[PDB]
Symmetry: D2
Subunit: 296 residues, 4 copies
């Protein structure tokens, strides 16, 4: 299969006066490229995909594609939906705009059955000829793509090559790779990047890498080179920031951290997301003190 693996960043989407700051966005993607990232994920969960318009979705993908031109860095575009017809259209659109692959979140809110999830992803995979990464985050969606459904999709659909797991369940990661060792398991939970990689995971889609792209890329590349000692050392050092970046719902902490570090101009979200509490604002600032944050 064609795959998209390695160190990847779920890009935040900076706002300026309520609009997407397109210049800041490209600047941030170039900063990821210059710090060893292998792929960028525009308009994922961390990018506030839920509150962007379809045109903003396209703008972010196009900027990502344009900024990665002439580099090895791939664009794995977020294109999920709770409606299969919309997810198919979003997958096709992302392919139009030049994306290298698709990240497709499991349907949220409507809690489809495993049979429904299979038909959902089959339709998406059959609509394009680029790689498709499943995305399991039951804490957000209210549903879980079971191991059996993931493996069936991997084996039955040419484009589907793995899953981004954000479920806090290392047992499921063992289950997945013990029964289907050919799939690409991608960590969607920064604090446990190293345990997923050390079990045969092949990449991360990281929130923390927005702030510390050099450290996350180094961790991932050490692990991929089977230098497990050095990968674990970075994972252990990153634990404090990895956890504080979820003291409130992502991406509220990571955007707060990017603002405190001077990497974005304004601490601006789109409702229903908003600024953190003053206490959590201060807690994030404290945790950042121990880390060296790359500039532009």
């Amino acid at each position: 299969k064609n795959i998209i693996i390695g160190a990847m960043t779920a890009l935040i989407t900076p706002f300026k006066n309520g609009k997407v700051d397109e210049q800041s966005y490209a600047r941030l993607i170039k900063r990821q490229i210059e710090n060893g990232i292998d792929a960028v994920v525009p308009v994922g969960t961390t990018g506030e995909s839920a509150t962007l318009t379809h045109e903003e979705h396209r703008t972010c993908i196009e900027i990502a594609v344009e900024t990665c031109k002439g580099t090895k860095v791939k664009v794995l575009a977020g294109a999920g939906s709770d409606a299969t017809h919309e997810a198919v259209g979003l997958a096709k659109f992302a392919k139009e705009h030049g994306a290298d692959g698709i990240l497709s979140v499991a349907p949220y809110y409507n809690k489809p059955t495993q049979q429904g999830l299979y038909e959902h992803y089959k339709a998406i995979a059959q609509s394009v000829d680029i790689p498709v990464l499943l995305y399991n985050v039951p804490g957000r969606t209210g549903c879980e793509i079971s191991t059996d459904t993931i493996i069936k999709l991997f084996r039955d659909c040419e484009n589907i090559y793995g899953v981004k797991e954000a479920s806090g369940n290392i047992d499921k990661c063992v289950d997945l790779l013990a029964h289907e060792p050919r799939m690409m398991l991608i960590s969607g939970e920064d604090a446990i990047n190293y345990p997923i990689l050390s079990n045969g995971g092949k990449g991360v889609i990281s929130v923390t890498s927005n702030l510390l792209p050099d450290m996350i890329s180094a961790l991932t590349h050490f692990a991929l080179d089977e230098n497990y000692k050095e990968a674990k050392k970075i994972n252990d050092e990153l634990y404090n920031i990895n956890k504080i970046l979820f003291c409130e719902s992502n991406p509220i902490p990571i955007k707060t951290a990017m603002y405190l570090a001077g990497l974005i101009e304004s601490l601006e979200f789109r409702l229903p997301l908003c600024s953190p509490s003053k206490e959590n604002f201060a807690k994030i600032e404290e945790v950042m003190k121990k880390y060296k944050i790359k500039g532009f």
Copy 2:
């Protein structure tokens, strides 16, 4: 406050050849009206709001408004979204399409903080001058509107008049009405309709009432008259069907039952929803035999 309470039905959305069956939809609402229902909820969770287009959202609301004209039955239109700007637009559309009130689900997937939830609903409430009922279903959304946030919204916003609770948490129902006895607590979980009403709840938004509107109507009106003995009797008799209607994710079982009862032509869903398993199809059919299902 202006309120919409009593026995209410979360209307299923019948499909025919991939399209909303507009004739069937009106016929089902008329059947609800003729069996003692006090309000209907077009395009809620049970109505597959996630997979309908904006045009189909508009059409279902318009059919409900037109069908309820000249009756006492109110239209409480589903108008929630995980994007505040989108929820505001849907609320304004429902008011302009003639809805009597709004049912607004808590933002799904992006997990806003309580502060974000407050600002989200404040913006919705200020955009219209019709009643707004909050809707808490953390099993589907991944977030919980806290009692403090519900009570703050009730006291701060004139049009927010209560909450549809679908959280299986009777402790919270006590918490809500002990600290704010003026709000309208509405049961969003059929199996525990009677316990919520007996604690001072003033209505239900029911899945079961699609199939058994006369029984749910009788249950609610018995309870509202403090005939708790007769209300509990109906709630107990309904437990088996109330539970089997969630053997798979709602609305898969209720649509299956409506099809088995001859109330809809086609057992059609929009992906990622699909037909139940063969075993659950047979279990739903068996449980239905205990109950007298009104026709048209």
Copy 3:
């Protein structure tokens, strides 16, 4: 069946210099009797049964039996264990010491299957000729007596007459009484005493009644007479104290409250239980100021 229902108190066990304060214990029981309580539960969870010796178990049961003599008040002795051979011995023990019935918690820690739970309680019930109340508290035991297992035990074992439910699950309470309306469902969760009673529950085994026995007794008798308005009023008024009495693991808050009220001489627990933090000590003290606490 022979039953023990009504307003019942899970008695705290006061300590003085590391030993059971036997005079205080008797005086506290008399105070419960004089404030309308229908039965007392020595050496339940609230009585720190886990850290008492078998000799101290006997002493508490004997004091309860002797103090209730010549009154209508029954003694429902705690007699559970995670070992069936030990639970049988404790049940026979309590019957021999003159207890009117036994409360037998589901086996903790070793997580028996439903079949094992059935055989466990069958063995206890066949060992005595006094009523047996099951006790489901999965948050403490790590296991759940299913509705099916409870109903089978009620129907198959003559002395098993109901269950004390401490699971926060009003759906299960509907399930239990809809399928077996002859059983005695007893609330083991103070905050939701009224909802359980209004669905046909026939008593409470209360923590709060240690502090406010007159209020819990009145709530229960209002509810048993279907004076739901009055019962709900008390339940709502009690919500704040009902919740603060679990700000730390019971019986740490209730013993703190009893000490603050002057009802026990020393705030002494047996390890691993200990004094609350200073912040929760102050929270309990503040909440108590809203309630009228009866003396001796």
Copy 4:
């Protein structure tokens, strides 16, 4: 600190006509020694400690100590209790009976606070001069030893050297070893033995090793020698048996497998534990056929 690490077995306790089969117990331990195990754990959870008498506790510890004498295999005796005074006595008795260290489960059922857990284990640690391993299994105890409490106990008490984790929470494993890399984190959940070891865990206390001691000891020794490829291979191969051994509550499946393998004479438990369902009996038998089971 003095430590007990490596591949360890939570020994089942075979019964014959209701009594501990002492000859079988010795035979099974010698079998563990012959297949590379580094320590044995008599009368843990897997050993049905809850239903053994004090005299049976001593017999099992004495048989383990004598069978391991003159070998390098250590005896890590189960000595926990929900009562601190009892846990202190059990620790002293295990020491007197010749154990090399103690495994002390967190108090079950009574749910002590973190302050209470600290004082509980401090009292245990001060009562003996042999190593003490904490044991966190919240699914059984209803309480969790927090990372902060574990680390404080490790730093404040000379005998306390690590924790057996059975919580399915690899995030906590990173948390523990990132903040206190000197502690001995021991896997108490077979399915994730390799992920815990690859993050710096230093041993396992295994259920599966009762049946497959050679495979578990090799997995552990591969991992400790930093041969992660071979450790993961065994962990992946063992996943099916690792999961089926918990299709019902441990130790019901492992005793069933040991009986099916001919390693014990009778499939006898002490109530409330009992034989598995006929369906799970067959599933266990089917899974076992894929594995080479060492004899005596």
